[PDB]
Design an enzyme around this catalytic site. Structure first.
Site, PDB file in Angstrom:
ATOM      1  N   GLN A 186      86.159  65.331  40.110  1.00 35.97           N
ATOM      2  CA  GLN A 186      85.886  66.275  41.186  1.00 35.97           C
ATOM      3  C   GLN A 186      85.087  67.463  40.647  1.00 35.97           C
ATOM      4  OE1 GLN A 186      89.457  68.171  42.600  1.00 35.97           O
ATOM      5  NE2 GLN A 186      88.382  69.291  44.228  1.00 35.97           N
ATOM      6  N   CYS A 192      90.769  67.556  45.877  1.00 36.00           N
ATOM      7  CA  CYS A 192      91.726  67.354  44.791  1.00 36.00           C
ATOM      8  C   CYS A 192      92.829  66.349  45.142  1.00 36.00           C
ATOM      9  CB  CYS A 192      92.332  68.698  44.351  1.00 36.00           C
ATOM     10  SG  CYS A 192      93.056  69.719  45.655  1.00 36.00           S
ATOM     11  N   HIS A 289      96.020  73.337  44.876  1.00 34.42           N
ATOM     12  CA  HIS A 289      95.378  72.335  44.024  1.00 34.42           C
ATOM     13  C   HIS A 289      96.385  71.206  43.836  1.00 34.42           C
ATOM     14  CE1 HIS A 289      92.324  70.722  41.483  1.00 34.42           C
ATOM     15  NE2 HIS A 289      92.950  70.914  40.335  1.00 34.42           N
ATOM     16  N   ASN A 309      94.077  66.385  35.709  1.00 33.96           N
ATOM     17  CA  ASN A 309      93.447  67.285  36.631  1.00 33.96           C
ATOM     18  C   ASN A 309      92.129  66.718  37.126  1.00 33.96           C
ATOM     19  OD1 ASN A 309      91.873  69.488  37.788  1.00 33.96           O
ATOM     20  ND2 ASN A 309      93.355  70.897  36.867  1.00 33.96           N
TER      21      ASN A 309
END
EC number: 3.4.22.-
Length: 346
Positions: A186, A192, A289, A309
């Protein structure tokens, strides 16, 4: 005659220095295992600090992790929990994290004879070299995706405070989702949750057909391909989507225990992390997030969680009992809950 990084001071709390020294080797070996890399001789470079353009100093310490001379990872020491954001640098508890955070970027110029300043704003991290500012890592969030580009000028006040430099160059158990694999990153949208679910679904169903774009397209079939990157995802949608994909997704408050992650991972059950800035209200579970849990590990006899992440090309490892995710703009997102995708029931 190597690379130097500008900082306010080179001083580091004895507490932090000791932690880093005690854990860097263990964290490095564990991540190499995860990134399918051949071990080597690990060393700790000198810790650098990061700054906002207005001169505010990031509350964490970043140590370059060197392998046979090359900078491959970055060990980050940050406030461990909410409670720590109120204490001082000397008194707060620190979590230890390892990832590839700007390691490639520093490595490419580690021998160059110049200096840089590591900066950060709402949209990411930058390097200031020879008066020029360049983006090194983007951190797209639902709140900056449709915002104009921030003033990329180094405050005169930061310049006054940067009084020294540091040199980056100066010197048993693992349990993960067998099919998990990073296939997309991303960097120019706020998907996300979609990125996390695509990777989890691809892992728990051993397939590669899921991707962030298609998931978002399924949730908003009437939004144009140009406004899609700006649309965000929400709990209710995640649950509803998983259902159509044969998964009973449940919301579970707080940080799942090391042991729960161990079991669920062995059951091939995905866990999505939900986090929100601690700058907002704590009693208002709103998506800030989302990340993907990949497994757990025990390094130097301490419990850790392995996760991904969406903004990264590699995994991250961090204290299992920490509830804070340190991101850009010196923001700390609290891990307030999770989405656990169980199997539908007959």
């Amino acid at each position: 005659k190597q690379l130097e990084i500008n900082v306010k001071s080179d001083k580091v709390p004895q507490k932090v220095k000791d932690l880093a020294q005690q854990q860097f080797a263990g964290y490095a070996k564990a991540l190499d295992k995860q990134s399918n890399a051949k071990t080597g001789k690990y060393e700790l470079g000198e810790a650098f600090k990061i700054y906002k353009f207005n001169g505010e100093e990031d509350n964490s310490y970043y140590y370059p992790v060197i392998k046979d001379g090359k900078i491959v990872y970055t060990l980050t020491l940050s406030p461990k929990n909410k409670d720590d954001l109120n204490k001082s640098k000397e008194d707060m508890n620190y979590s230890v994290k390892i990832s590839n955070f700007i390691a490639k970027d520093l490595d490419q110029i580690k021998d160059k004879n110049s200096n840089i300043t590591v900066l950060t704003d709402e949209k990411g991290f930058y390097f200031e070299e020879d008066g020029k500012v360049r983006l090194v890592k983007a951190t797209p969030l639902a709140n900056n995706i449709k915002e104009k580009e921030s003033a990329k000028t180094v405050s005169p006040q930061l310049k006054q405070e940067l009084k020294t430099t540091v040199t980056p160059t100066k010197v048993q158990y693992e349990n993960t989702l067998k099919n998990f694999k990073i296939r997309e990153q991303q960097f120019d949208n706020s998907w996300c949750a979609g990125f996390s679910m695509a990777a989890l679904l691809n892992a728990t169903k051993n397939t590669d057909t899921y991707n962030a774009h298609d998931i978002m397209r399924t949730l908003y079939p009437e939004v144009s391909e140009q406004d899609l990157p700006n649309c965000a995802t929400f709990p209710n949608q995640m649950i509803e989507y998983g259902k159509s994909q044969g998964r009973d997704i449940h919301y579970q408050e707080g940080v799942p225990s090391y042991n729960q992650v161990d079991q669920l991972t062995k059951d091939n059950v995905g866990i999505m992390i939900l986090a929100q800035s601690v700058s907002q209200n704590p009693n208002d579970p709103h998506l800030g997030h989302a990340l993907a849990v990949v497994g757990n590990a025990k390094i130097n006899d301490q419990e850790k969680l392995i996760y991904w992440n969406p903004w990264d090309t590699e995994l991250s490892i961090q204290d299992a009992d920490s509830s804070l995710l340190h991101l850009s703009f010196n923001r700390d997102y609290n891990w307030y809950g999770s989405m656990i995708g169980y199997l539908e029931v007959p």
